[PDB]
Design a protein around this ligand. Structure first.
Ligand code: W0F
Ligand code: MG
Ligand code: ZN
Ligand code: ZN
Ligand code: ZN
Ligand code: ZN
Ligand code: ZN
Ligand code: ZN
Lengths: 93, 479, 576, 45, 67, 98, 44, 87, 257, 8, 49, 82, 115
RNA sequence: UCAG
């Protein structure tokens, strides 16, 4: 039921029935590059250029296109080095 | 009879004539499921056999001819008019429908290695390479000669020793992959000597030259065709199919000692899984095995015309009972490894099996840091061009589902088309950058200080530049 | 044009950016290998030699990498390249100076792929997440990829010319990602249906049913050999079930050693009589059904698709849920090896003897067909006299077709049941259907009794010619044979007209397959594109890229789909 | 143009597409083959 | 194309028997009687001679490439 | 040149005009096996587009009894759109009606 | 550099950049003769 | 190389200014010559401009020492005599 | 804890067949002997071919294959011959190989059948089982085949060309009494040639105490070796394999301790 | 190929 | 002379028409070859109906 | 954020385990000091697994909440998912 | 192209040991013997003769992979007997059986001919 | 034009 419920929640989240088509998906206010990857492509890019839209770069497809690490799992967090723990312990090599 | 129609105006000559050329080779077609007859019609086009008796004279690309074709032991009457007996494509093979070691599971097949050693399903693959000495160029002449590394400024480090004086390798010389079959040189205009133009063997061909011919083509230029012969012993990747729609690769090859044996000493040439038969409902395969056993013992080629009404399974079974075997064709088998009788009695009989053109040697490809395309600076495409496999959009969706962001990044950026660009901080547009001069400047701002290096796929750089040429400005700002 | 380049599929936006051709990838035919574990894949030596994984030289591994460098590209466990600290790459094939071969910490030797190297294995189309799984590499001496048979079900792959793609991760970080997220044992259970994806299949399922029968008794030496192929054996031979007169083990007694740890599970065999649970002998089952495993020991029952297959509550599912993924991997592999080595002793086959039935059964099938044809004739005569009364909501033509189809379907099913009664215990069609390995009761019925009615576009065979199906039939013939009923079985052989009508039905099946592939592909792509960026944030809210809250908790309870199981509330139904 | 070898002839390679100094094996130029890629009739049109 | 030496399944030499089989067929023996007379007893061996197609005669019809 | 071009390319028309050209005619003969040669020579090609997935032109029709092989059709995107003649089928050459 | 002729099967030596025509028959289809170096064949 | 490595955090889309196109393009005065070849190979102010990009896989473009890899290419501009609608 | 003492009776002994019964033996030993017949009895067969001229319709590797499969008389010389790997000389010498030469040209109009009789050996003992003939190839007028071949010692585990036997028939428990094979319908199955039962009874009554014994053999030869000699050589070769194992095992046992 | 309610 | 027409093999206007099988062998053409194809630019082309 | 008022899960997520083990292994391959005594383990990934078991990996995970704040959990503080 | 040479099945490559004896830690008085470049032929005889010995508690043989060439034989004996002793004695007994069989087969041959 |  989780997988059915998620699709139903994404289609009815905005308050108007969002068809899983170019029209419904592209009308939602996602990033222009993410819309570009689905169906309309160049037309989406032209409209975004005309209206001065800015891509937040928070999407998975947008980060995949630019070669950056995706915000998906294993990319949600950022690892930092712990200096105090490096000092502790037996540093054999 | 009981009156149905008393006004028949025409009569069919024979109902089996509704089938076509490829479906006419199927024995007992009426005992098979329909999709399986459709599948056999397609598989029979891809089988190997002597395609034509003048194959020695012909120089065709991609010709396969089987060493020892045999005519079917169970044959249709309409096969005679198709000349299938004259030019057969396949070998009658003692086939056991059994589960032996698990290597015949799914649709694979266990084959006898000793039989393979004795000629079973051995074929020759001929590949012809054509080259034309074209003098049409104003100052370019593609002369046939043996290129010399010192004399020719353009050359390659593959072996050129094989070529004779004429630039054509002599027949009877082994050619391994990346060897020069034909050596050709284009004279180079001295704008102010030689760009190499030899032809190289397809990788892993590993054949012996059969015929080399030199003629003049329709255009009158010198034409050379070279045919390379490669023998093809069946392997554990090769695809074999019967006439009843059962296709499968060779799972493993066991020697005659390892194969199960009957009390007479007959070991199956091919072992197919019992699980193939029931779901596919190809009962014609079983009836062909029974009729083949009867035919081989009796000495007469069996009749498998589709609609006979004089040939029934019960009649075939009684005939087999006369010849000393179990009436349904089952036989007591002994395990090759241990010698103990197998508790279940295995169904063994001769069945016409074909060898399909699809072989593992032609289908194996591996790519690691090969050449890249010009336009996208991405890996090439195709086995011939050493191309990498495509990581499609469905694949990237599976990797997103996995949560493996860094494997997705390596596969879609680092493995394919890594690249670096310099981008102005003030304006997102890319900026001119001389690494050797160490001076980096952005036109349009007259700003040199504010430039940042950005790592992006080359395809993304191309996309952004194609957007710019459409007057769209994809200003990528690090902030 | 620029818009033409970007817009279409295979354009820069999708064909070169969202997906693209990649390096360090290999493809070849796949063939079976029961001996490899679930996670292992068998890679040919040439594929292994071309693909290289770069290893950083450390003080720990400098000696091993030095030996690999000395071997070079020619000897198989060699190194193709050396990458220096400066970034200079020394291709070892062309002669490197003996000075260059020397290695120091920080150099990266590109060794050939060796046994134990984690790879990602793919089969197109990649419909679901289990279609890309991480496999350990085992190098074997032929030119086909070799994967275990259980792993075929997730990939939807059989060995009839199929091919698969091999991608080698090139960094320790991405190798760890595959090892800890995408390995085959980690994805035994799918979150889609909270069931195990992989189950025992083909020979091992068919033979596990026969192994687990009450009849099966194994002598001392056969037990020795079976225990030899059990990887997790404690080394202690179980005490035989029959000590005297001759020591004889049972199939269940050996299978109990395969079962991991202490797993408690109750399932029912496919042939379980419905009345058995209510009546006596509920626990001492007369037919040896009602599989019960207590303390990881098979007390009773015959294993089949239900117990060892891809279904919820299966023994494999309970193993993954209770023992863990590693022990479950060993469970799959041990079932396969031990049962496949017993099948050498027992054996399996399919022959014509299985298709043939008793003469009484054939006469019964024929009598059912005779009376069915007579019933269809009576319906036709009623329709001609206009005595037939239209069913509400249907025309008289529709109601005639309904009644005729009901008569023919009842006859078909009754003949099928007679055929299925005729099957003996030894019948191998029944072995495969009962075990669930392949086939169905329908296939047995069509093989032995009656192929059945051939329907095209949901109706009997239509009148392609003017008012008749084929030129041989008389105009306006709505009888059973004319419109497509195939009275003969496959073993008996179809008459010519029945052959053509059967071909028409099979063509409909083929067309449906070809159409469904394309339409489903489009639907799947659109769903993924609509929902790609939705993910569980660290608030545990499910949010998209815009950070809009799709769900406040995932699935409304914040739990993942693979861990959950089917359960009964037990407070709901009872009366006050 | 191998830096350690003044006036060294670099052998072409087909497998990866690079020119490699034959006496030391250094790869000069990484992926510099790529694909590497009627004038008679009329002229430029 | 030519009669195989060594029947595939068992390995009995069957290549010396093709011309004798053809001759016995000319002598009006039935194919089964000819196979019995030649000594081929297992159905594996009989398959070799019974199903063989001698294409090498058809190939010999063509003139030699070099005289 | 017109006859040779239309045969070699497979496009049925003129060199300058490809708008009305019909592709798929004049394929290279398959010589894998004699059966493949024969079936390639006796082959029918329905003009319906492969891209269209509408199933009516693909289904086997009752009137194909004895004229077209029921079993032999390519399996894939062209199911039922490429057909092979039956053994005794003979296409009429044509005659004057006078 | 000895070419066998298709039509009359007579070997004719042809120098480089010489027309491919067999003396005594005029045929323009020549075959290069079998190489002198010998190849070992495993009977396997 | 001295420039710090940065990851794009926002992509801003907009119509390119004609003044910005003039300033940005390496070609000065526009593409005056339809022909791509002058002096044999290179045509300054033509379609194949040495400053616009690297040619022949061995040359270096005038603007930077690309060597067919480092250079990302540089844009040029054509000054249309009379304005034209963008499709 | 000791080996059973087996016995042998030879029922038939012809030029191409030996039928014998081994009694008081285990099934594993009998099956391993059967296996050694097929794969570990050494024989001399052609393994190296250099073809000088081949104008025949069959290509060169076809001719090589057919030549390899031709059986060669190896009755007594095979024990004297050494494996090519054992011999110290480079490539092949008279101690490690036998040289066969074939030169046939068709000048008559009638088709010339190149037979095994045309194979000429330098060593008199090794001859292609000629003392019809195996047909190597058929030659049209103007077609010539000249080749030189060397024959090496080997066994059938390497290649089936070195398989001494045609068919080894192994059978035990002719009337099913240990119920090793469970017949679904006992009556339908044909009785074995060695069965001792009357026609009325299809199977012998089950004997729980019995174990497989009295194994029946029928060994047929290709003519490479005398059929008696195949059996004797197999027994001797299996004994040699076990003795080599014992030597290496003794080395390992001593080294560990 | 079975019936109207089954498969073709 | 107004042009040249490609000739389908073994049709009435082909050289191979009405030739005994021995004669076909003398021309290095197979007696069993079906015909029905054009040899255009050296490749055999078949007009699919 | 403050060290107090940490709202994320105490258990280490599977993705964090993958990335931490891979990153620490890459560090070990680059001759970083190893906290855990190795019993003849040469493979960097196996040494990283040993360190993770001993909870001596010197990495702190920064978990980004959707509101923009971050919580810094040390690898030791997180309960291993195993 | 990746096909192994045929001689690899029975020829030990240099540096390979025909027999390697490794003890089994799980159970007392158990050793696991690995025989290289051998097949079911030797393994089955050795296992059978071992099973005939009253002091051998366990004896089995396993080919780990058919494509590879190796036999693994596990022998467990009672205390006061060693697995290595059992293996040696099994080989001696098999050799005795085979020699007796050869003598009797030669006698049978000589009797069948001219008798 | 085949292969899934
Ligand atoms: C089982 O499903 C597979 C997969 O879905 C994949 N596949 C195959 N063709 C296509 C295609 O055109 N387009 C897409 N997207 N996928 C495709 O192939 C399907 C089956 O096809 P089949 O039904 O022929 O398999 P047999 O039942 O025939 O197997 P035998 O007995 O021969 O081994
Ligand atoms: Mg498949
Ligand atoms: Zn700027
Ligand atoms: Zn150098
Ligand atoms: Zn035989
Ligand atoms: Zn001539
Ligand atoms: Zn530049
Ligand atoms: Zn020597």
């Amino acid at each position: 039921y989780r997988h059915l419920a998620l699709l139903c929640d994404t289609m009815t989240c905005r308050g108007h029935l969002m068809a899983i088509t170019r029209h419904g998906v592209n009308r939602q206010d996602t990033g222009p590059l993410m819309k570009c990857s689905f169906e309309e492509t160049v037309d989406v890019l032209m409209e975004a250029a005309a209206h001065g839209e800015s891509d937040p770069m928070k999407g998975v497809s947008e980060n995949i296109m630019l070669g950056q690490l995706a915000p998906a799992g294993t990319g949600c967090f950022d690892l930092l080095l712990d200096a105090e723990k490096c000092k502790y312990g037996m540093e054999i090599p | 009879e009981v009156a149905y129609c008393s006004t028949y105006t025409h009569c069919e000559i024979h109902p089996s004539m509704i089938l076509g050329v490829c479906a006419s080779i199927i024995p007992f077609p009426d005992h098979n499921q329909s999709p399986r007859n459709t599948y056999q019609s397609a598989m029979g086009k891809q089988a190997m056999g002597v395609y034509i008796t003048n194959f020695h004279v012909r120089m065709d690309t991609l010709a396969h001819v089987l060493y020892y074709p045999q005519k079917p032991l169970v044959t249709t009457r309409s096969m005679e008019y198709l000349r299938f007996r004259e030019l057969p494509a396949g070998i009658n093979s003692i086939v056991a429908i059994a589960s032996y070691t698990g290597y015949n599971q799914e649709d694979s097949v266990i084959m006898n290695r000793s039989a393979v050693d004795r000629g079973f399903f051995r074929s020759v693959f001929y590949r012809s390479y054509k080259e034309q000495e074209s003098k049409k160029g104003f100052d370019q002449e593609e002369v046939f000669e043996k290129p010399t590394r010192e004399t020719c400024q353009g050359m390659r480090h593959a072996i050129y020793d094989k070529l004779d004086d004429d630039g054509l390798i002599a027949p009877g010389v082994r050619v391994s992959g990346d060897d020069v079959i034909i050596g050709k040189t284009v004279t180079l205009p001295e704008n102010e000597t030689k760009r190499d133009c030899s032809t190289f063997l397809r990788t892993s061909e590993t054949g012996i030259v059969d015929q080399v011919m030199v003629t003049l083509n329709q255009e009158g230029y010198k034409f050379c065709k070279i045919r390379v012969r490669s023998v093809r012993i069946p392997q554990i990747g090769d695809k074999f199919a019967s006439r009843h729609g059962q296709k499968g690769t060779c799972g493993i090859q066991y020697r005659q000692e390892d194969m199960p044996f009957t009390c007479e000493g007959i070991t199956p040439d091919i072992i197919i899984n019992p699980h193939a038969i029931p779901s596919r409902m190809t009962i014609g395969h079983l009836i062909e095995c029974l009729q083949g056993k009867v035919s081989a013992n009796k000495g007469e080629i069996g009749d498998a015309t589709p609609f006979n009404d004089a040939v029934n399974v019960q009649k075939i079974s009684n005939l087999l009972s006369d010849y000393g075997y179990h009436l349904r064709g089952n036989e007591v088998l002994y395990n090759g490894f241990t010698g103990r009788k197998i508790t279940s009695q295995i169904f063994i009989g001769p069945t016409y099996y074909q060898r399909l053109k699809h072989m593992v040697d032609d289908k194996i490809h591996s790519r690691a840091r090969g050449p890249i395309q010009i336009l996208n600076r991405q890996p090439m495409e195709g086995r011939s061009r050493d191309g990498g496999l495509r990581f499609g959009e469905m694949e990237r969706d599976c990797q997103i589902a996995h949560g493996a962001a860094q494997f997705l990044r390596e596969r879609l950026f680092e493995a394919s088309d890594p690249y670096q660009v310099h981008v102005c901080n003030l304006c997102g547009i890319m900026a001119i950058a001389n690494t050797r001069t160490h001076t980096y400047e952005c036109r349009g701002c007259r700003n040199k200080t504010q430039i940042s290096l950005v790592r992006m796929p080359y395809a993304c750089k191309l996309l952004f530049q194609e957007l710019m040429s459409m007057s769209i400005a994809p200003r990528m700002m690090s902030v | 044009s620029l818009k033409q380049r970007l817009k279409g599929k295979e354009g820069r936006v999708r064909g070169n950016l969202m997906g693209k051709r990649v390096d360090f990838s290999a493809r070849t035919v796949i063939t079976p290998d029961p001996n490899l574990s679930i996670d292992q894949v068998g890679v040919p030596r040439s594929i292994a030699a071309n693909m290289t994984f770069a290893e950083i030289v450390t003080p720990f591994n400098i000696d091993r990498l030095q030996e690999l460098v000395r071997r070079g590209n020619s000897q198989y466990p060699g190194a193709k390249y050396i990458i220096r600290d400066n970034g200079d790459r020394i291709d070892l094939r062309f002669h490197p100076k003996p000075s260059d071969l020397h290695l120091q910490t920080g150099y990266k030797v590109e060794r050939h792929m060796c046994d134990g190297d984690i790879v990602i294995f793919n089969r197109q189309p990649t419909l679901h997440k289990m279609s890309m799984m991480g496999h350990r590499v085992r190098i074997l001496p032929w030119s086909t990829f070799r994967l275990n048979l259980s792993v075929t079900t997730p990939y939807n792959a059989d060995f009839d010319g199929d091919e698969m793609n091999l991608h080698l991760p090139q960094s320790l970080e991405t190798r760890a990602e595959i090892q800890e997220l995408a390995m085959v044992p980690r994805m035994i259970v799918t979150p889609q249906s909270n069931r195990p994806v992989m189950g025992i299949v083909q020979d091992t399922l068919t033979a596990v049913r026969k192994f687990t029968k009450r009849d099966v008794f194994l002598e001392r030496g056969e037990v020795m050999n079976l225990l030899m192929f059990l990887s997790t054996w404690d080394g202690k031979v179980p005490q035989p079930a029959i000590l005297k007169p001759r020591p004889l083990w049972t199939g269940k007694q050996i299978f109990s050693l395969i079962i991991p740890g202490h797993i408690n599970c109750i399932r029912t065999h496919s042939t379980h009589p419905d009345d058995e649970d209510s009546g006596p002998y509920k626990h001492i089952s007369p037919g040896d059904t009602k599989v019960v495993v207590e303390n990881g020991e098979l007390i009773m029952g015959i294993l089949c698709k239900k117990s060892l297959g891809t279904s919820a509550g299966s023994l494999v599912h309970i193993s993954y849920l209770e023992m863990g993924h590693d022990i479950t991997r060993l469970f799959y592999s041990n079932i396969q090896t031990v049962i496949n080595n017993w099948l050498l002793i027992e054996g399996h086959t399919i022959g014509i003897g299985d298709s043939i039935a008793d003469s009484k059964t054939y006469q019964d099938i024929q009598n059912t067909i005779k009376k069915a044809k007579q019933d269809v004739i009576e319906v036709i005569e009623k329709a001609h006299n206009n005595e037939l009364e239209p069913t509400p909501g249907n025309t008289l033509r529709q109601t005639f077709e309904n009644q005729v189809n009901r008569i023919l379907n009842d006859a078909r099913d009754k003949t099928g049941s007679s055929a299925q009664k005729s099957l003996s215990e030894y019948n191998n069609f029944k072995s495969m259907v009962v075990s669930g390995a392949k086939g169905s009761k329908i296939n047995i019925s069509q093989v032995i009794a009656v192929v059945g009615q051939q329907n095209v576009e949901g109706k009997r065979i239509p009148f392609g010619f003017k008012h008749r199906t084929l030129p041989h039939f008389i105009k306006d013939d709505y009888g059973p044979e004319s419109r497509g009923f195939v009275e003969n079985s496959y073993l008996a052989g179809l008459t010519p007209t029945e052959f053509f009508f059967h071909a028409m039905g099979g063509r409909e099946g083929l067309i449906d397959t070809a159409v469904k592939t394309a339409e489903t592909g489009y639907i799947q792509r659109r769903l993924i594109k609509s929902m790609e960026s939705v993910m569980v944030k660290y608030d545990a809210t499910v949010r998209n890229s815009i950070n809009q809250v799709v769900q406040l908790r995932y699935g409304e309870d914040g739990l993942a789909g693979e861990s959950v199981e089917f359960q009964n509330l037990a407070t709901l139904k009872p009366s006050n | 143009t191998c830096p350690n070898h003044p006036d060294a002839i670099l052998v072409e390679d087909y497998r990866a597409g690079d020119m490699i100094c034959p006496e030391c094996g250094l790869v000069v130029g990484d992926r510099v083959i790529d694909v590497g890629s009627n004038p008679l009739l009329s002229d430029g049109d | 194309m030519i009669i195989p030496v060594r029947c595939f399944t068992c390995g009995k030499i069957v290549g010396n028997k093709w011309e004798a089989y053809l001759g016995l067929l000319q002598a009006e023996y039935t194919e089964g009687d000819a196979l019995d007379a030649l000594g081929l007893k297992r159905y594996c061996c009989r398959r070799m001679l019974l199903a063989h197609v001698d294409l090498i005669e058809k190939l010999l019809n063509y003139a030699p490439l070099e005289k | 040149d017109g006859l040779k071009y239309s045969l070699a390319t497979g496009n049925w028309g003129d060199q300058k005009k490809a708008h009305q050209a019909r592709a798929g005619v004049s394929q290279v003969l398959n010589r894998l096996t004699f059966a493949s040669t024969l079936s390639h020579l006796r082959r029918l090609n329905s003009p319906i587009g492969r891209d269209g997935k509408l199933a009516k032109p693909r289904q086997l029709h009752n009137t194909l009894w004895g004229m077209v092989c029921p079993a032999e059709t390519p399996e894939g995107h062209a199911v039922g759109l490429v057909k092979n003649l039956a053994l005794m089928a003979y296409i009429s050459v044509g005659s004057q009606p006078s | 550099m000895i070419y066998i002729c298709g039509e009359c099967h007579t070997e004719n030596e042809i120098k480089s950049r010489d027309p491919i025509r067999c003396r005594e028959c005029g045929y323009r289809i020549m075959y290069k003769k079998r190489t002198k170096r010998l190849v070992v064949f495993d009977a396997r | 190389s001295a420039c710090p490595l940065r990851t794009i955090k926002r992509v801003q889309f907009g119509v390119l200014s004609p003044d910005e196109l003039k300033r940005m393009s390496v070609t000065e005065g526009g593409i005056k010559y339809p022909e791509t070849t002058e002096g044999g190979r290179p045509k300054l102010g033509g379609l194949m401009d040495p400053r616009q990009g690297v040619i022949e896989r061995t040359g270096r473009c005038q603007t930077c020492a690309g060597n067919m890899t480092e250079c990302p290419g540089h844009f040029g501009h054509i000054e249309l005599a009379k304005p034209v609608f963008h499709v | 804890p000791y080996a059973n003492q087996p016995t042998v009776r030879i029922t038939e002994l012809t030029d191409e067949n030996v039928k014998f019964i081994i009694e008081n033996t285990d099934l594993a030993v009998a099956n391993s002997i059967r296996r050694v017949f097929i794969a570990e009895v050494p024989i001399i067969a052609i393994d190296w071919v250099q073809i000088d001229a081949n104008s025949s319709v069959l290509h060169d590797e076809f001719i090589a294959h057919r030549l390899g499969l031709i059986p060669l008389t190896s009755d007594d010389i095979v024990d004297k011959l050494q494996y090519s790997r054992d011999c110290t000389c480079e490539e092949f010498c008279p101690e490690c190989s036998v040289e066969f030469t074939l030169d046939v040209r068709c000048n008559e109009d009638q088709t010339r059948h190149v037979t095994s009789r045309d194979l000429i050996s330098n060593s008199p003992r090794v001859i292609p089982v000629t003392s019809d003939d195996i047909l190597i190839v058929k030659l049209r007028k103007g077609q010539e085949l000249r080749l030189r071949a060397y024959a090496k010692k080997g066994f059938g585990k390497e290649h089936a060309k070195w398989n001494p036997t045609a068919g080894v028939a192994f059978e035990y428990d002719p009337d099913n009494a240990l119920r090793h094979t469970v017949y679904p319908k006992p009556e339908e199955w044909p009785k074995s040639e060695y069965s001792e039962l009357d026609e009325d009874e299809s199977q012998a009554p089950y004997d729980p105490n019995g174990k497989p014994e009295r194994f029946y053999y029928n060994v047929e030869s290709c003519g490479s070796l005398r059929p008696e000699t195949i059996v004797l050589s197999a027994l001797s070769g299996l004994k040699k394999k076990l003795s080599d194992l014992q030597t290496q095992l003794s080395h390992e046992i001593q080294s560990d301790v | 190929i079975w019936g109207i309610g089954c498969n073709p | 002379f107004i042009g040249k027409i490609p000739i389908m093999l073994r049709s009435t206007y082909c050289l191979l028409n009405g030739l005994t099988d021995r004669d076909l062998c003398e021309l290095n053409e197979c007696p069993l070859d079906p015909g029905g194809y054009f040899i255009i630019n050296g490749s055999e082309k078949v007009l699919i109906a | 954020q403050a060290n107090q008022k940490r709202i994320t899960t105490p258990y280490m997520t599977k993705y964090e385990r993958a990335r931490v083990l891979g990153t620490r292994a890459l560090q070990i391959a680059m001759c970083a000091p190893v906290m855990v005594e190795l019993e003849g383990e040469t493979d960097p990934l196996l040494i990283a697994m040993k360190e993770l078991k001993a909870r001596k990996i010197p990495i702190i995970i920064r978990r980004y909440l959707p509101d923009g704040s971050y919580e810094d959990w040390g690898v030791d503080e997180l309960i291993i998912s195993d | 192209m990746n096909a192994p040479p045929a001689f690899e099945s029975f020829l030990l490559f240099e540096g390979e040991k025909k027999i390697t004896i490794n003890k089994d830690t799980k159970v007392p008085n158990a050793c696991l013997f690995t025989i290289n470049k051998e097949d079911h032929t030797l393994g089955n005889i050795i296992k059978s003769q071992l099973l005939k010995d009253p002091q051998v508690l366990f004896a089995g043989y396993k080919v780990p992979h058919p494509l590879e060439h190796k036999i693994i034989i596990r022998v467990q004996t009672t205390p006061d007997y060693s697995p290595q002793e059992a293996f040696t004695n099994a080989i001696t007994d098999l050799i005795s059986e085979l020699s007796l069989l050869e003598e009797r087969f030669r006698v049978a041959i000589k009797d069948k001919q001219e008798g």
